[PDB]
Amino acid sequence: KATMIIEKDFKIAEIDKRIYGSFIEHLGRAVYGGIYEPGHPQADENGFRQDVIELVKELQVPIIRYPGGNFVSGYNWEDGVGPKEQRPRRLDLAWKSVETNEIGLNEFMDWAKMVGAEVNMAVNLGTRGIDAARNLVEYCNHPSGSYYSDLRIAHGYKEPHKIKTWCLGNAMDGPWQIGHKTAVEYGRIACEAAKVMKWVDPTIELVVCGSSNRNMPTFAEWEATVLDHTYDHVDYISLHQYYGNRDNDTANYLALSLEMDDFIRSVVAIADYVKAKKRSKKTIHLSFDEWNVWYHSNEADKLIEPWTVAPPLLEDIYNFEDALLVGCMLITLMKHADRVKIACLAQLVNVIAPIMTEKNGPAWKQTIYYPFMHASVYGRGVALHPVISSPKYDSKDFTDVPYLESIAVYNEEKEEVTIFAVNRDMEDALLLECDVRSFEDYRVIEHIVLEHDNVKQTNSAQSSPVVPHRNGDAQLSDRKVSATLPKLSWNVIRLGK
Amino acid sequence: KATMIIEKDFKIAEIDKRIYGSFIEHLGRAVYGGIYEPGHPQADENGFRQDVIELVKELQVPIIRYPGGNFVSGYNWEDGVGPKEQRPRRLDLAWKSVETNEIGLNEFMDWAKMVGAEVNMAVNLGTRGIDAARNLVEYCNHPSGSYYSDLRIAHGYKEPHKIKTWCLGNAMDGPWQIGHKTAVEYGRIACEAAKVMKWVDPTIELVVCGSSNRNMPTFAEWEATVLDHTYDHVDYISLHQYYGNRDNDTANYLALSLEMDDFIRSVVAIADYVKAKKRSKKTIHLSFDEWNVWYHSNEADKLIEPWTVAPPLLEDIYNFEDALLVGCMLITLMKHADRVKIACLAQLVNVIAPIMTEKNGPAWKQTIYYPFMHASVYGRGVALHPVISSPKYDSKDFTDVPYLESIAVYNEEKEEVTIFAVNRDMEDALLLECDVRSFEDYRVIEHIVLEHDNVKQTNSAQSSPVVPHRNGDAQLSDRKVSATLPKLSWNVIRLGK
Amino acid sequence: VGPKEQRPRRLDLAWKSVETNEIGLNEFMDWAKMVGAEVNMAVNLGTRGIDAARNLVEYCNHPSGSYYSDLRIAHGYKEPHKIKTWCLGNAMDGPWQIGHKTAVEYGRIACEAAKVMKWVDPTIELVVCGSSNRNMPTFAEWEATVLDHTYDHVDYISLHQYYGNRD
Ligand SMILES: *[C@H]1O[C@@H](CO)[C@H](O)[C@H]1O
Ligand SMILES: *[C@H]1O[C@@H](CO)[C@H](O)[C@H]1O
């Protein structure tokens, strides 16, 4: 048995819909053969895959980070704009590919508009710096009457793109990054970039790069230093996290969101430390601008030859347990709606992706597609504080892991309450009881469940054995939702009226 | 009108009783004329005033920091032990007084035993260092069989004092401190002291010094550096805060507890930053080991001549508004019961104190005595998460100041719920309604009120216009407590069964 | 040193033992004479420093005519021990050492100790401490910094290694 109190007045915060963002890099088949495939029978007039467009629209992704990622740290934005015959072929040193620049930022904006997403644009602070940062912002955002704004118009884009939210580089804390910088070097260049970008267009927001990963030897130290350098000029700091089940330990794998919860709290604490050191009245929030499962494809990648166009990199095929873990991360992001304002599922298409495509073939939904869709579609509203009493278990790296991972989100305007919940129990159902006196005249609309008996089962172009059903047994009597959560299930219990 | 949900399952944490601690320094008449006055009509056989002893027991202070404070940073502990004839007279540079050392550590422990309080002993890291630190821990804590343990025995204390919780110096971030140290310098010596101390006795816990003040130019930077140097060897970091109403603005003055809230949150975030930076599993908590109102006596102290014995320093005479703020500070401590585990009202007797004495005369209770007693006696148990909805106001330095400052503390063993509440409103009563559905069969026991028309009214040896009364109108009906909180009142609503 | 009655019992924090001090430096030299070995005497730079370092070199090596040399004589050792080779502390790069010091801190105090020691007796030679262990996170960095601080005043740097067959 597990209990929960769903009280309307115990609120975490309004959820920023941008926690349901995603990310496309110039990496592998994410662009070329992903969003864009001129050959394809389902391609539109500009070469965009309509099938992929529809699949992204159904996710309701409000914001997509572009164009990187490790890619941007060696990229010249001018190489992807203007007449295609003048666009150079470049060696992408990030992923050891030849980049044709057949797609550049203006074509990507056109695509984003098709899927109804705004673009979280990144500037190169690896091989480039402040001049290119300001010039890119002018090119994108200044209406007209200057060289770069008039350039965008000459390139066929009369109206400014008016990009709101920019990333100051990609994580350059690692020795594998193009133009790696120590935290003082980065904080200094980010500061000066942030300044000029904001002087070109003061309506923008800036995300400074956190650590590329929580295991980095400079983790936490990085963020503190970077923020100490940038605090007054920026709006968010980012964090990044990928998970994997490399030692076949399902119970331990599903517990990993407890680490994510702590990682978030840590980065929040750094921001609040620096806030206090500067005596600033401004609070800096988090952009969790890379998160996913990523591991399945590590060995296949090692054999890709350098200097191909659009190599099949990072193409993980997700299973059912991966979907439960993604569900637990989504609940974790919602749990921190007060401080996490942007997040990006890395990445959106082909590359560690909820959507996979085949050349001249179908686009299909991975297992992780479902819990992401559910969170994005039914998780707009106010994240409520979970007061859970749940049984617990110990695993290799965690103790007191709840079997129940859960949160409710109340949308006042639709008059709905959705309860997201994962049963981590590998053997037994969990009987959830939720106390909803705070909500008068509500009923159960439906109870959706994603469950499969085999945690390693994948989806594919030809069959999808791992798909939600609507036969969850949740019922509401005398101010209490009772619901059976099957073992290893993701559950979406929706309430209305 | 204000509301409040008193929900038993929404808990902050168990309250550590040491948040009701205090502090006595070799300062002013805190010791000589305070705890200790030979030939006072109420002096016991060791010279300790019995009236003072009863007043402290009534407060139920569990722990008392000693002997400093700024005094410890220039103090040799050996000067206050052994036969009085061999104890030298010293220039105390901290308070420009002659310290005869007629009281030292063994006599203080004798007094501490009388009031039922453990002692939070501080070691000098101003003029002294790691050798003195180990020798004092040995002298106090090691049974026998070494020079310093046998020395204690010989001085007449056969059993070890067995002091649990030590302070690694006093705050030395200030230019006014004896033996001021930079955060690096202090961090390194605190680190090496903590080590040899814990090697003498691994049962101890250590408090590293935070900033002497939130307004210090090195605030926050200090804590992060100090913790970077000491994390693995220490258990708590301290914070210090005093408040004053020098511009006669009551509305702003009562809101100062919102600042203490932010300060606690800041220091917690710094501890959690350094934890993450070190990848430690240990959480560091806070010792709020100086807090109080302090300002009334600033001008009188300027006229005191250097190099007297036991000059009448820091002898603030508190008023009623001062008690309301102290009440707000106490509620703020409870609100942070999850991370603030020790706290020390600075100071206990004569010196910025809830208890005042006169030579050969009476001992009396300042206004601030009452909210502290109420908080200590009735605030044992679990602090519950306040879910309040209060009207609010703006002052000089704060926005959206709740008229209602309140928290409930649940004592499951006594089956009681205590609601502490201040109404900061200077004109209007506040009608509090408390939802108490999760406490079935609970009744109002009593409603204590401390109120006075004149905020500037003080108590004195001769009369106490400012005392609690029990004419509060709190009543249970239909699972809800309704209570009228008068303008500018401290209220304790006690429920049970 | 001196009459056993006035020698105190101490908590040795290194090995968590009570050290009665029934043996100290003059008795050890007595034993060293029996086995025909000279003594490589180490000075405390953990809890102590340059004043103790000079006073111990004087006590051991200066003939007579000063407080510490006459004190040795009075303790019953008329001729100086004439110790040639001293250790400037013990390895303090470790978090487990009493009075751990960073390479800079150790370097600076070793430097000033080496000076006053050699001024008492220029015939001595000094060993500055290297890393307590090859696996220390500050290995090599430590030695370079320590030597940068002490090169001109010292003669040797130490190294320490233990082996085991635990697998
Ligand atoms: C996070 O990992 C890769 C793929 O998502 C990006 O290049 C990066 O910064
Ligand atoms: C805090 O303020 C004074 C008096 O309480 C002490 O000496 C100190 O460290």
UniProtKB/Swiss-Prot annotation, chain C:
The chain holds residues 85 to 251 of 502 of the full protein. Involved in the degradation of arabinan and is a key enzyme in the complete degradation of the plant cell wall. Catalyzes the cleavage of terminal alpha-(1->5)-arabinofuranosyl bonds in different hemicellulosic homopolysaccharides (branched and debranched arabinans). It acts preferentially on aryl-alpha-L-arabinofuranosides, and is much less effective on aryl-beta-D-xylopyranosides. It is found in: Cytoplasm. The active site is at A91 (proton donor/acceptor). Belongs to the glycosyl hydrolase 51 family. Induction: Transcription is repressed by glucose and by the binding of AraR to the operon promoter. L-arabinose acts as an inducer by inhibiting the binding of AraR to the DNA, thus allowing expression of the gene. The gene is abfA. It comes from the Bacteria. This is Intracellular exo-alpha-(1->5)-L-arabinofuranosidase. Disulfide bonds: none annotated. Homohexamer; trimer of dimers. Alpha-L-arabinofuranose binds at N90, Y162. Transmembrane segments: none annotated. It comes from Geobacillus stearothermophilus (Bacillus stearothermophilus).
